[PDB]
Structure formats: structure tokens, C-alpha cells
């Protein structure tokens, strides 16, 4: 049933069963300094970032290296650009980066209090200033997050500046899987902006479907990072379950000494302004703003055996957990095989095996349908067309689809069948004839 071949895994081997020393558990943060852009467009750094052995990466002083203008992202510039833009606010209590405490501050705990509000960039930029104001007068916090640069109109010069980036860091690249979904998934293939005051905290998580993440500190203020290799993710999960916080949907701040006691190595590093953090596929992380700063982040799937697997594992994992994979993987794999060539021998062979199963399933789902006497219509495809999801379970639907009215809905077989037992009142369609898929399959081969 699975779309992956375990025998094909490009994952590293960390069968490590020996308590690593203290120097191991506080391992040095992989880091790169960019003299010149020539460096930036080098393949060597691409190698580095994608290396499955490097869960996180900080390129140093990258911005000034490409001469990227971060004033475009300054809070002053954003207010002019859009003053009334909506931003969601997360209210929290200001604490030190490694600690999360109970209200009485007696003991330390995983679950992270977070409370949503909304406001305008306008007012919030005001708060960011009125906060820094009193800090001066001296010598509970609000956090702006999930602000869309998606609109290419008012954000135009903004988005036209991160085109200076190497191909693999860009929001849209023919070599970026998020680019083959064929529609917008916000803050992944769009740019999200964060405006912070000191102690602004993002709790533990992984990127959607294990996609790599690019993050650039606008500055001035520093951002403190913590991260853990994708390998340990399910044991961290185990902590959340224990503490009654949802791993995937929940807001949690890890207790480091818990992780250390788990023989779990932790990267911390500081991100200064102009520094680009690259989160590799799979890496559990959480962040805290030591300063006043703005940050910018979007998601990038590279094309690598590693990225693809982890994307697809999480995908199968979400079906199982009954969470929605924000990326329509089977749609993407097909959309890619067709558009893009492939050098990478493991990557190739992985998408191919996935496609085969994608193809094998339709052939079954159809076969059980046709002997069930169901009429299967063919509806072709429009250009610029979205992937499909069930209405109830939110699982991805590809190829054959189940439609209902009152204006139209799409279901998977199970959720459909439940509704109507004989698929009565349901119209089964095929977006792809069996030959269509058949040819596109062997049309897919290996590029030098
Ligand atoms: O930059 C921040 O505050 C949070 N960023 C992320 O979690 C990311 O880029 O993946
Ligand atoms: Ni993240
Ligand atoms: Zn369903």
C-alpha cells in the first residue's frame, strides 16, 4: 500500500546506542561565511545545506554579501507599503530562552501558553516602538506572526529582492517542489513575515510535510535558535503525549535537560541580522527573539532523495494521524515527473516507485468500481488547477474523485461511501485515463 520503498532509504545511520559525552550533546552549529556571491551561487554550499548530516545551517553575513537590501523589510518600510495589513498577534509571558515555567514559576513544563489576537501592522509597528521606548526609560509580550507578503503588488520590491538569492533558496524555482503544487500554500511558497519584541517565542515544530525552511533575520535584534535532527522527532513527540500537549497541533517548549537526559543532541546558535538560517528537511526547532527584529521565512523543497523521502514519509504519516498534509504529494510527484528532468539517481528511482504505486492504486480503485457496476466518467483537466482533498478527512484525492452537490464537493472512497452506502448521489470521475498515466510513467527517465 505504501508509496515508499524502505529498501530505498537515503537516511543517515544513527544507530547510536552509546551515551554521547557532554560535548556531543552540545554540538557545534554548522556555519558558513560568504565572502562573495560567487560563493553564494556555488554548488558546494548547496551540497552543504542539503546534507542529511546537517540538520540546521547558518550562513554568515549572507545578505551584505549579496548586497540584499533589508531596509525594504524594516518596520518603517512595511507600514508605508501596507499600513492596514492584518497581522496575527501571539500574547505570551517574557521568559529566558531555555526556560518555560508554570504560573507560580515553581517547576518547568513543556506546554507553551499562547493566545491569539489580531491587529494591523500599523498598530503593531507602534507597539514594537512603544515597547523599545520604555526599555530605554528603564535603562507580558506581543508577537507579530504570519504576515503575508503573498501579494506581489504592494510587496513587489520586497519579493524582487529575494530573487537575488541562489536558485535553491528562492520562493519559486523550477527546482523547488513547492513550485510544482500548481497553487498557493501560504507561508510555504509564499513569504511570511514576523515582527518581534524581545522574548518573542515560536514553539517546537516541523515544517509542513518536512520541507526545508529558509529564514532571514531583518535585524537589528538577534534571534536565538534551538534545533534537533529529524531522527529524534518521535521521541520528542513522546514527551508531548506524556504532558498532554499535541505534538503536531500543540504549542510546546522543550525542557532541554529532558532532551539531554534522552541522549539527544541540541543545536543552539544565534542568528544576527543578515544571517540566513537554513533548516534542512525534518529538523525539529523552536526559536526566541533576543532582540527587536523582523524576520522573513518561506519554505523550499529542494530535489534530493532525502528531501523527497522525508516529505513523503510525513505525508503517509499524516494520512495515518488524520491530519492534513499541506502539500499534495502525489499531485506534486506527477506534476514534477512531467515538467522537470532529474539527474539524481536515488531521487529519480524514488519518485518513480511512488508513481508506480500511484498508478497501481487507481487501477485497483477503478477495478473494484467497475465490477461494482459504477459508471466512471472522465473529466479532463484545466490549466492552473488545484490538487483535491476529501471534505471530511482532508486526505488527498488524486485521479478518480467522488463528487456531490448542495455547489460541488469531493470525497475519498471511504468518506463518500459512509455518506451514501452504494455511491448513490455520488459521481465518480477520472482526471486521468489509464493510458494517459501509463505513458507519462515511462516518459519519465533519467537526466545527466
Ligand atoms: O523565524 C522565526 O521566528 C520562526 N521561523 C521558523 O520557524 C522557520 O523559518 O522555519
Ligand atoms: Ni519552523
Ligand atoms: Zn475522506
UniProtKB/Swiss-Prot annotation:
Its main location: nucleus. Fe cation binds at residues 205, 207, 285. Residues 154-317 form the JmjC domain. One of its GO terms (biological process) is mesodermal cell differentiation. Induction: By inflammatory stimuli; mediated by NF-kappa-B. Keywords: Chromatin regulator, Dioxygenase, Inflammatory response, Iron, Isopeptide bond, Metal-binding, Nucleus, Oxidoreductase, Phosphoprotein, Ubl conjugation, Zinc. The keyword Disulfide bond does not apply. The keyword Nuclease does not apply. GO terms for molecular function: beta-catenin binding; chromatin binding; histone H3K27me2/H3K27me3 demethylase activity; metal ion binding; sequence-specific DNA binding. GO terms for cellular component: nucleoplasm; nucleus. Zn(2+) binds at residues 390, 393, 412, 415. It is found in: Nucleus. Histone demethylase that specifically demethylates 'Lys-27' of histone H3, thereby playing a central role in histone code. Demethylates trimethylated and dimethylated H3 'Lys-27'. Plays a central role in regulation of posterior development, by regulating HOX gene expression. Involved in inflammatory response by participating in macrophage differentiation in case of inflammation by regulating gene expression and macrophage differentiation. Belongs to the UTX family. Interacts with TLE1. Component of the MLL4 complex, at least composed of KMT2B/MLL4, ASH2L, RBBP5, WDR5, and KDM6B. Interacts with TBX21, SMARCA4, SMARCC1 and SMARCC2. This is Lysine-specific demethylase 6B. The lineage of its organism: Eukaryota, Metazoa, Chordata, Craniata, Vertebrata. The chain holds residues 1155 to 1636 of 1641 of the full protein.
Amino acid at each position: 500500500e505504501s508509496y515508499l520503498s524502505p529498501a530505498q532509504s537515503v537516511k543517515p545511520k544513527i544507530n547510536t546506542e552509546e551515551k554521547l559525552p557532554r560535548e556531543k550533546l552540545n554540538p557545534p552549529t554548522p556555519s558558513i561565511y560568504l565572502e562573495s556571491k560567487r560563493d553564494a551561487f556555488s554548488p558546494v554550499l548547496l551540497q552543504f545545506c542539503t546534507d542529511p548530516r546537517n540538520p540546521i545551517t547558518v550562513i554568515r553575513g549572507l545578505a551584505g554579501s549579496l548586497r540584499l537590501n533589508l531596509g525594504l523589510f524594516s518596520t518603517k518600510t512595511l507600514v508605508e507599503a501596507s499600513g492596514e495589513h492584518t497581522v496575527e498577534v501571539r500574547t505570551q509571558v517574557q521568559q529566558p530562552s531555555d526556560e518555560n515555567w508554570d504560573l507560580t514559576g515553581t517547576r518547568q513544563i513543556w506546554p507553551c501558553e499562547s493566545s491569539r489576537s489580531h491587529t494591523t501592522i500599523a498598530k503593531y509597528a507602534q507597539y514594537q516602538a512603544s515597547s523599545f521606548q520604555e526599555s530605554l526609560q528603564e535603562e507580558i509580550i506581543k508577537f507579530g506572526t504570519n504576515i503575508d507578503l503573498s501579494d506581489a503588488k504592494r510587496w513587489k520590491p520586497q519579493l524582487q529582492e529575494l530573487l537575488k538569492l541562489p536558485a535553491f533558496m528562492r520562493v519559486t524555482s523550477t527546482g523547488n517542489m513547492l513550485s510544482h503544487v500548481g497553487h498557493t500554500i501560504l507561508g510555504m511558497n509564499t513569504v511570511q513575515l514576523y515582527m518581534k519584541v524581545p522574548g518573542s517565542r515560536t514553539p517546537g515544530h516541523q515544517e509542513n510535510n518536512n520541507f526545508c525552511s529558509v529564514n532571514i533575520n531583518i535585524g537589528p535584534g538577534d534571534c536565538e535558535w534551538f534545533a534537533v535532527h529529524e531522527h529524534y522527532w518521535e521521541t520528542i513527540s513522546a514527551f508531548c503525549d506524556r504532558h498532554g500537549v499535541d505534538y503536531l497541533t500543540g504549542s510546546w517548549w522543550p525542557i532541554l535537560d529532558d532532551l539531554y537526559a534522552s541522549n539527544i543532541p541540541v543545536y543552539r546558535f544565534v542568528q544576527r541580522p543578515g544571517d540566513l538560517v537554513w533548516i534542512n528537511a525534518g529538523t525539529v526547532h523552536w526559536v526566541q527573539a533576543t532582540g527587536w527584529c523582523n524576520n522573513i521565512a518561506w519554505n523550499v523543497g529542494p530535489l534530493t532523495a532525502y528531501q523527497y523521502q522525508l516529505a513523503l514519509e510525513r505525508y503517509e504519516w499524516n494520512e495515518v494521524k488524520n491530519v492534513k498534509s499541506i502539500v499534495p504529494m502525489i499531485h506534486v510527484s506527477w506534476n514534477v515527473a512531467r515538467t522537470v528532468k532529474i539527474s539524481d539517481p536515488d531521487l529519480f528511482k524514488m519518485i518513480k516507485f511512488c508513481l508506480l504505486q500511484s498508478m497501481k492504486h487507481c487501477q485497483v480503485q477503478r477495478e473494484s468500481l467497475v465490477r461494482a457496476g459504477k459508471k466512471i466518467a472522465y473529466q479532463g483537466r484545466v490549466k492552473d488547477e488545484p490538487a483535491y482533498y476529501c471534505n471530511e478527512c482532508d486526505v488527498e484525492v488524486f485521479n478518480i474523485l467522488f463528487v456531490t452537490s448542495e455547489t460541488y464537493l469531493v470525497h475519498c472512497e471511504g468518506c463518500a461511501r459512509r455518506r451514501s452506502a452504494g455511491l448513490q448521489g455520488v459521481v465518480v470521475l477520472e482526471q486521468y485515463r489509464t493510458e494517459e498515466l501509463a505513458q507519462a510513467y515511462d516518459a519519465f527517465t533519467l537526466a545527466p
